[PDB]
Amino acid sequence: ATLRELRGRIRSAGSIKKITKAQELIATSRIAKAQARVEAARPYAAEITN
Amino acid sequence: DVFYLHSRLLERCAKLSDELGGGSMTGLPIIETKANDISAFIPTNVISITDGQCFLESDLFNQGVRPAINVGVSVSRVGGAAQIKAMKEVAGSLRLDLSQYRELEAFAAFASDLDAASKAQLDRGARLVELLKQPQYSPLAVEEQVVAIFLGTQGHLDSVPVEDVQRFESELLEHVKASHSDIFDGIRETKKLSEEAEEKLVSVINEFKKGFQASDGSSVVV
Amino acid sequence: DGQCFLESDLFNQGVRPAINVGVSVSRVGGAAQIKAMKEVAGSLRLDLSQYRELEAFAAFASDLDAASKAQLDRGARLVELLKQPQYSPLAVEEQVVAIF
Amino acid sequence: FSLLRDEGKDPVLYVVGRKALGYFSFRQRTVVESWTGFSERPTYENAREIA
Amino acid sequence: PAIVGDEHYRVAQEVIRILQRYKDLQDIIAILGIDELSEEDKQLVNRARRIERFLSQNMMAAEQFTGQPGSTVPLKETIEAFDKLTKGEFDHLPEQAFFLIGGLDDLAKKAESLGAK
Amino acid sequence: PAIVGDEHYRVAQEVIRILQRYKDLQDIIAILGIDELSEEDKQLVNRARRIERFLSQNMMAAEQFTGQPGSTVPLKETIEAFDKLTKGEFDHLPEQAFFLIGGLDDLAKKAESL
Amino acid sequence: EAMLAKTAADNRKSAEQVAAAQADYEKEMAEARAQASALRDEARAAGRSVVDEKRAQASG
Amino acid sequence: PVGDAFLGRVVNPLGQPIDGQGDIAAETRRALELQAPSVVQRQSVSEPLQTGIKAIDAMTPIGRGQRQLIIGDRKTGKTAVCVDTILNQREAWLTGDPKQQVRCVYVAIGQKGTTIASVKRALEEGGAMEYTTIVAAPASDAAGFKWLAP
Amino acid sequence: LADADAMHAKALADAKAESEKVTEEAKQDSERIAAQLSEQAGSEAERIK
Ligand SMILES: Nc1ncnc2c1ncn2[C@@H]1O[C@H](COP(=O)(O)OP(=O)(O)OP(=O)(O)O)[C@@H](O)[C@H]1O
Numbered sequence: 046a047t048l049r050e051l052r053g054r055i056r057s058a059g060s061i062k063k064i065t066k067a068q069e070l071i072a073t074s075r076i077a078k079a080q081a082r083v084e085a086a087r088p089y090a091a092e093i094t095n
Numbered sequence: 096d097v098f099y100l101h102s103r104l105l106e107r108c109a110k111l112s113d114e115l116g117g118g119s120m121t122g123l124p125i126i127e128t129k130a131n132d133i134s135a136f137i138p139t140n141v142i143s144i145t146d147g148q149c150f151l152e153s154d155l156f157n158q159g160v161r162p163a164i165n166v167g168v169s170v171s172r173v174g175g176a177a178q179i180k181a182m183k184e185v186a187g188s189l190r191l192d193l194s195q196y197r198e199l200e201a202f203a204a205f206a207s208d209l210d211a212a213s214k215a216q217l218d219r220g221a222r223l224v225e226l227l228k229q230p231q232y233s234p235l236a237v238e239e240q241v242v243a244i245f246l247g248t249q250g251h252l253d254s255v256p257v258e259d260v261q262r263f264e265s266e267l268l269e270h271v272k273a274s275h276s277d278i279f280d281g282i283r284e285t286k287k288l289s290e291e292a293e294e295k296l297v298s299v300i301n302e303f304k305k306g307f308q309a310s311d312g313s314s315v316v317v
Numbered sequence: 318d319g320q321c322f323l324e325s326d327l328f329n330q331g332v333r334p335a336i337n338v339g340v341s342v343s344r345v346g347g348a349a350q351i352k353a354m355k356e357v358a359g360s361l362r363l364d365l366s367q368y369r370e371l372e373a374f375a376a377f378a379s380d381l382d383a384a385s386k387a388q389l390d391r392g393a394r395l396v397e398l399l400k401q402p403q404y405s406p407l408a409v410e411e412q413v414v415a416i417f
Numbered sequence: 418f419s420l421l422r423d424e425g426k427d428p429v430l431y432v433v434g435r436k437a438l439g440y441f442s443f444r445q446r447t448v449v450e451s452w453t454g455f456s457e458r459p460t461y462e463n464a465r466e467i468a
Numbered sequence: 469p470a471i472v473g474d475e476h477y478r479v480a481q482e483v484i485r486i487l488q489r490y491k492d493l494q495d496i497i498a499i500l501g502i503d504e505l506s507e508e509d510k511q512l513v514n515r516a517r518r519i520e521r522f523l524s525q526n527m528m529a530a531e532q533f534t535g536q537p538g539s540t541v542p543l544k545e546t547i548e549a550f551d552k553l554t555k556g557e558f559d560h561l562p563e564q565a566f567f568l569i570g571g572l573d574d575l576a577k578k579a580e581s582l583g584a585k
Numbered sequence: 586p587a588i589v590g591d592e593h594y595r596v597a598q599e600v601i602r603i604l605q606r607y608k609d610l611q612d613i614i615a616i617l618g619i620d621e622l623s624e625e626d627k628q629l630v631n632r633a634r635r636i637e638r639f640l641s642q643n644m645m646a647a648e649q650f651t652g653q654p655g656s657t658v659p660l661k662e663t664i665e666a667f668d669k670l671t672k673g674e675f676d677h678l679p680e681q682a683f684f685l686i687g688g689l690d691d692l693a694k695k696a697e698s699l
Numbered sequence: 700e701a702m703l704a705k706t707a708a709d710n711r712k713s714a715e716q717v718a719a720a721q722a723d724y725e726k727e728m729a730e731a732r733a734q735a736s737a738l739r740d741e742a743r744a745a746g747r748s749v750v751d752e753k754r755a756q757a758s759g
Numbered sequence: 760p761v762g763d764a765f766l767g768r769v770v771n772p773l774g775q776p777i778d779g780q781g782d783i784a785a786e787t788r789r790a791l792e793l794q795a796p797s798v799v800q801r802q803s804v805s806e807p808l809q810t811g812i813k814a815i816d817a818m819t820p821i822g823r824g825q826r827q828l829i830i831g832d833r834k835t836g837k838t839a840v841c842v843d844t845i846l847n848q849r850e851a852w853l854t855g856d857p858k859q860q861v862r863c864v865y866v867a868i869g870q871k872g873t874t875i876a877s878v879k880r881a882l883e884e885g886g887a888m889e890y891t892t893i894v895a896a897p898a899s900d901a902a903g904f905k906w907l908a909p
Numbered sequence: 910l911a912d913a914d915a916m917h918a919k920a921l922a923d924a925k926a927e928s929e930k931v932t933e934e935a936k937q938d939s940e941r942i943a944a945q946l947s948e949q950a951g952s953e954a955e956r957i958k
């Protein structure tokens with residue numbers, strides 16, 4: 046049964062790896078968007094500060 | 096000598112030279128694996144002996160993919176030499192499309208973040224997976240397969256929902272066979288899809304799409 | 318005619334006796350119990366198996382509906398109720414009252 | 418919080434997000450007001466309400 | 469479909485597909501939690517938990533082990549109930565309502581027992 | 586370095602590094618698009634694509650399939666060519682110039698053919 | 700003033716009609732398409748039933 | 760024994776009919792251990808063998824003279840694929856041109872008899888039984904028959 | 910406004926014409942399908958005989 050449960054663990058870890066890599070790429074895109082939002086907010090902040 | 100058993104058995108399936116008559120014998124040995132263990136002794140021997148392998152998987156079968164052939168690992172060392180020109184042309188892009196779709200399947204729900212090209216890849220792969228499904232005891236003539244694969248790989252399924260693809264395909268294959276059989280003729284008796292036949296088929300597909308009714312009522316036009 | 322599976326991981330967690338409810342079973346069942354015990358503990362083993370299933374499932378559930386939380390609390394209380402120190406036997410009626 | 422306690426001040430806690438909510442629930446600290454559900458993409462409306 | 473009919477085969481295939489997807493997602497749920505799934509995957513997980521509970525049944529021979537008298541479900545009722553389950557008609561009921569019962573009437577009674585309709 | 590020398594080893598390691606980092610960028614480029622990448626990342630992507638195309642060659646066996654005859658590149662010529670490539674001394678040229686050619690002479694000649 | 704209001708209303712109505720004409724067009728296009736699809740579906744069902752009863756009687 | 764009379768018949772590994780349909784006229788006899796065609800008696804595999812299944816015919820095409828393994832766990836559809844191929848050969852058979860026709864042999868090793876009967880019924884439905892021969896070594900046969908059937 | 914009303918009327922007329930055309934096409938192809946399936950049923954019945 047050792048081999049059976051080891052293979053099960055391998056399958057689980059593979060699925061986890063896929064999910065985590067996808068989330069990492071999605072987070073890259075989200076970082077891009079958030080930085081864009083910060084840039085968009087910058088000018089009004091500068092003007093109101095002035 | 097178990098390897099010798101199977102190897103001597105399976106080496107008698109051959110394509111004879113024209114001097115000996117040109118006859119041939121094609122072997123389709125079946126191997127049952129346990130727990131999908133293709134590294135067992137007899138599966139290893141037979142995999143070594145044969146030219147290509149079609150790996151059928153229980154998980155794919157349960158997922159609805161029928162026949163449950165794992166295109167990722169299934170190989171045919173003979174390859175395009177065993178295909179007619181029309182089939183080789185239309186099916187050329189299937190392998191890469193399917194591989195890219197299997198890579199992108201992890202991003203099914205994040206289509207907003209996917210660039211246009213990658214979302215197109217995902218959608219096309221979904222349609223193509225739905226395309227390869229086939230009911231039992233329903234073999235298709237090579238011309239019918241060529242037309243179905245042409246639908247899949249030319250983007251003519253991009254306007255159809257996944258849940259309808261199969262049905263669409265079948266109905267279209269009926270429609271052509273009912274009223275535009277000359278396309279099937281051309282393909283079968285010339286083994287290639289000529290340009291005029293291709294354009295006529297495209298027009299037929301567009302008319303059928305104007306006629307087609309999706310399951311949810313969505314228009315599949317353009 | 319059945320087995321009492323004992324696990325070291327359950328033993329270390331404080332579950333004494335360390336009986337693994339999900340896989341332990343008696344093949345005689347209520348026929349081996351008095352009427353009162355059979356009444357109070359009719360479906361205790363299935364309850365606890367389902368509770369372990371849910372606890373594994375709700376390990377990282379940010380929130381749960383009312384039913385799931387109620388089942389988890391009931392299962393935790395039952396698991397505590399089944400713990401027992403060594404050399405501390407309970408007469409059958411005491412066990413019936415505790416399970417009740 | 419430690420610095421404010423040193424300065425003879427009492428922290429009055431406000432929270433944006435649920436992770437801090439859970440942390441302070443465990444710590445038993447009271448949260449006067451909490452806004453959640455926009456940490457990933459906050460709008461100016463949420464900031465205006467908080468301010 | 470040739471023997472058991474189109475509806476029976478369709479419902480069985482849908483149940484099998486849902487359960488296979490649930491098995492595939494089970495490890496992800498174990499590690500990352502259920503909140504990190506897509507909305508459709510969350511619906512499928514709820515549906516699959518209810519389906520697997522409903523597949524259980526209180527058997528006549530099992531009363532000795534539970535004290536609960538057994539029940540028998542006709543084939544048509546089974547097909548209809550699992551069609552409804554796969555379509556998400558009972559997604560609102562607690563999953564515990566589907567555990568060790570008979571047909572749809574037993575499901576309604578047990579759901580009422582749990583404070584849901 | 587003990588066997589092939591210092592310069593050969595240095596150029597090989599630089600090529601391997603560039604190709605490895607391009608491989609790392611493959612997934613990001615595919616899912617998120619190339620424009621998501623930085624300017625340094627895009628420069629490296631261009632250089633790595635050029636390097637991996639130059640690793641192709643017109644084989645003698647390829648003569649039967651494609652009429653163009655094969656080429657033999659002396660080892661020193663390969664070392665100097667890939668040293669130049671890793672230094673960006675060819676980024677301006679298009680990718681197509683780097684398919685199935687021999688040494689730097691062939692590279693230039695095909696470049697003037699584009 | 701009434702003439703100006705009428706001109707504005709007529710422009711609005713012309714804009715409405717250039718869309719409602721195509722709307723009704725597509726509406727009964729879809730109606731005819733659905734009716735044809737239903738006719739084909741019932742024809743296929745009738746054929747399947749006919750072949751099934753032929754199978755049964757032939758077997759008997 | 761070997762001959763065209765073995766088409767449409769079910770035999771055991773010794774060629775004796777078991778379908779109960781009478782005798783089989785043998786064109787000649789052939790030893791089971793005759794050597795395979797030599798490396799110089801063959802030519803390249805260049806003719807499609809259409810299985811009728813889009814997956815195989817597009818992704819893993821099978822040419823005439825090829826050995827394509829169908830490998831998988833139980834109840835994954837292996838026999839379905841093979842029977843689909845055998846049925847797909849029907850139009851080629853009806854052509855009448857031997858350069859297109861494919862004679863089919865189905866060797867059933869160790870299967871229970873009713874499973875072989877089911878396969879034969881499926882082949883009869885599709886008309887494949889006119890160009891198909893079944894060599895049956897059911898589960899109840901001696902290990903010698905199971906070893907010799909292929 | 911007059912032109913829009915005329916266009917609407919002609920669009921309705923053309924819609925009616927094409928609807929009749931597609932309906933007759935649907936009837937024709939449904940009859941073709943029914944005849945084909947009946948012929949196939951007869952053929953397979955003769956096969957069973
Ligand atoms: N393409 C298909 N579509 C739907 N059902 C299919 C398909 N192919 C096979 N099946 C069904 O799958 C089940 C298993 O098929 P099959 O017996 O051909 O598989 P197998 O791998 O040869 O099985 P076994 O281990 O029993 O020999 C059967 O119910 C068959 O009807």
Ligand SMILES: [Mg+2]
Nearest residue numbers: 834837838839
């Ligand atoms: Mg089988």
